[PDB]
Every structure is written in structure tokens, then in C-alpha cells.
Amino acid sequence: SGVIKPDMKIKLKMEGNVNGYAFVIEGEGEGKPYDGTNTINLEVKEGAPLPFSYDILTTAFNRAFTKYPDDIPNYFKQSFPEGYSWERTMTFEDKGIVKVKSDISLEEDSFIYEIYLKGENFPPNGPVMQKKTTGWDASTERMYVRDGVLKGDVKHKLLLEGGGYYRVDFKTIYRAKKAVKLPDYHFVDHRIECLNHDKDHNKVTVYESAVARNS
């Protein structure tokens, strides 16, 4: 078998603060990197109960889990076993901002993520701080090369209870820890879903599907 098996495990820690509220979340899970699916079981270890929408964390909880056709070089799978890091800005239409960074490494058949997240300037009675969001819409991330690394943009939408929407622009820089074959611009279609296991989101399962396709 190769560096990336059809079944891989996940271990992560996120340290973060949102509007001056600190927390630590640990996760373990599994996915099918070639199917482009992954599941993570998350537990709040510090800062329970979280005083904000869990949805601003879930896209931080690994493009190794993306279905890719052979005719698009796979920036992410090529980077292993050394791995890659990413840095992301999420700009919210009400001037909320999240900055998050992650280091993705590999030990045997377990990906390991080290995540740091800072959210600030959320309106205190807005849908994020009042936990009025109901997940992310399906999305398309445009992948493109700038400054010899891979970048992704999403014009994203947070769904609001009552059936409205909240615009969020994602900009991500993905940096392989070694030289890999760079792809031409392409798309990754995402679907991310949350299953909470309790009232306070102390325990949550996140599921994501991701499929790459050509221009």
C-alpha cells in the first residue's frame, strides 16, 4: 500500500478564541481520501459551553480528503508524507473576521492537524454570537496557483435559522512542505454537515464531501 491508503485516521487539536472567548477542541476521526469524504468527532476540552456558532469552526476541522481525477495534479496527496500547512481568512458581511491556520502532518496512517483560530468583531446579538446559524450551504472552491503555492477562494453562505443566509468570503493559501507538481486552475465542490451530540455542542461530529473537477 502507498503513503495515502483508501482509509486514513484523523487526530487534531484546535486552540482558539472568538470575540475574546477562549476554547480548546480535540478531535479524532477517519475518512476515505480517494472518495473525498471525512468524519471528525470533536470534544470541547476548554471553554465549554461555547458562546458562539459552532459553524465558524467546522471548515477548520484537510484537502487530502478530496476526490481528484488523474488529469489534475493532486497538490495535497503529492505533499505526503511530509504534508502541508494552510492559512485562511473568512470575512463576514457584518464585518466579523476569522483567521485560522493549520499544520497537516502524517504518522503511519493518521493525519495530525495543529489548528489555531482567532475570530473577532462579530456583532454581539448577531447570528454567530447568538448561535442562529444552521450550517453551510454546499460550496465551490476555485483552486489556482499564485507565488508558487495553491490558493482557494469560496464565495460562501452561512444558512440562518428561519431560512435566510449570511455571506462569507474564504481565501486560503495551501503550502506543500516539499515541491509537488502544480495543477492548472480547477474547482473543488464541498458539502459540510454538523451532527451535535448535546445541547451545548460539547460533542459534535463534522462530515465533509469534496470533489475536484476541471475547468
Curated annotation (Swiss-Prot):
One of its GO terms (biological process) is generation of precursor metabolites and energy. The keyword Transcription regulation does not apply. Fluorescent proteins have become a useful and ubiquitous tool for making chimeric proteins, where they function as a fluorescent protein tag. Typically they tolerate N- and C-terminal fusion to a broad variety of proteins. They have been expressed in most known cell types and are used as a noninvasive fluorescent marker in living cells and organisms. They enable a wide range of applications where they have functioned as a cell lineage tracer, reporter of gene expression, or as a measure of protein-protein interactions. It comes from the Eukaryota. Contains a chromophore consisting of modified amino acid residues. The chromophore is formed by autocatalytic backbone condensation between Xaa-N and Gly-(N+2), oxidation of Tyr-(N+1) to didehydrotyrosine, and formation of a double bond to the alpha-amino nitrogen of residue Xaa-N. Maturation of the chromophore requires nothing other than molecular oxygen. The precise stereochemistry of the tyrosine has not been determined. The keyword Zinc does not apply. Keywords: Chromophore, Luminescence, Photoprotein. Tentacle and oral disk. Pigment protein that is green in color. Belongs to the GFP family. This is GFP-like fluorescent chromoprotein cFP484. The lineage of its organism: Eukaryota, Metazoa, Cnidaria, Anthozoa, Octocorallia.
